[PDB]
Design an enzyme around this catalytic site. Structure first.
Site, PDB file in Angstrom:
ATOM      1  CD  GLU A 185      -3.215  -0.716   0.003  1.00  0.00           C
ATOM      2  OE1 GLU A 185      -3.183   0.391  -0.521  1.00  0.00           O
ATOM      3  OE2 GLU A 185      -4.034  -1.590  -0.372  1.00  0.00           O
TER       4      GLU A 185
ATOM      5  CB  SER B 165     -11.888   9.651  -2.051  1.00  0.00           C
ATOM      6  OG  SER B 165     -11.573   8.556  -2.884  1.00  0.00           O
TER       7      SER B 165
ATOM      8  CG  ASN C 163     -11.039   6.222   0.053  1.00  0.00           C
ATOM      9  OD1 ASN C 163     -12.198   6.544   0.189  1.00  0.00           O
ATOM     10  ND2 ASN C 163     -10.331   6.592  -0.967  1.00  0.00           N
TER      11      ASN C 163
ATOM     12  CG  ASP D   8     -13.697   8.487  -5.476  1.00  0.00           C
ATOM     13  OD1 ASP D   8     -12.603   8.961  -5.125  1.00  0.00           O
ATOM     14  OD2 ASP D   8     -14.279   7.679  -4.766  1.00  0.00           O
TER      15      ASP D   8
ATOM     16  CG  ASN E 101      -8.562   6.907  -4.439  1.00  0.00           C
ATOM     17  OD1 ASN E 101      -8.873   7.039  -3.258  1.00  0.00           O
ATOM     18  ND2 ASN E 101      -7.553   6.173  -4.818  1.00  0.00           N
TER      19      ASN E 101
ATOM     20  CG  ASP F 235      -6.510   5.550  -1.047  1.00  0.00           C
ATOM     21  OD1 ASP F 235      -7.720   5.781  -0.802  1.00  0.00           O
ATOM     22  OD2 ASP F 235      -6.166   4.637  -1.826  1.00  0.00           O
TER      23      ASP F 235
END
Ligand SMILES: [Pt+4]
Ligand SMILES: [Pt+4]
Ligand SMILES: [Pt+4]
Ligand SMILES: [Pt+4]
Length: 129
Positions: free
Chosen positions: A35, A50, A59, A48, A46, A52
């Protein structure tokens, strides 16, 4: 902070992640490796809108507030920046809520694709725990 593999295994174990909801320590260390490459300061945007955050790339759509994810839910009740700290406590406490949510560690796409069904014990091999 960039953790060493065994250093992180030890911190995760101390914070109660070894066998949390049935996932051995190796699973958590493998997820962190893929990750964030063990870097608490990792962020990734991301499609959309959002973002991380942190060692376990938690998220902002669901789990934390970053002030820029319209309709986000802040389920861990925490500014997302708290997830970037060298102290992993906030990330660990939030990850515990995530993995309890019904989908286990499948919530982490890199865990599903790169750790699931592999010999995850290799990630803690040689560590003093
Ligand atoms: Pt530093
Ligand atoms: Pt600690
Ligand atoms: Pt320690
Ligand atoms: Pt928001």
């Amino acid at each position: 902070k960039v953790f060493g593999r065994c250093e992180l295994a030890a911190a995760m174990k101390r914070h109660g992640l070894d066998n949390y909801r049935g996932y051995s320590l190796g699973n958590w260390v493998c997820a962190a490796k893929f990750e964030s490459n063990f870097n608490t300061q990792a962020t990734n945007r991301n499609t959309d809108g959002s973002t991380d955050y942190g060692i376990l790339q938690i998220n902002s759509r669901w789990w934390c507030n970053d002030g820029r994810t319209p309709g986000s839910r802040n389920l861990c009740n925490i500014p997302c920046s708290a997830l970037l700290s060298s102290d992993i406590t906030a990330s660990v406490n939030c990850a515990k809520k995530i993995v309890s949510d019904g989908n286990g560690m499948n919530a982490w796409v890199a865990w599903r694709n790169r750790c699931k069904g592999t010999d995850v014990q290799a990630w803690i091999r040689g560590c003093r725990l």
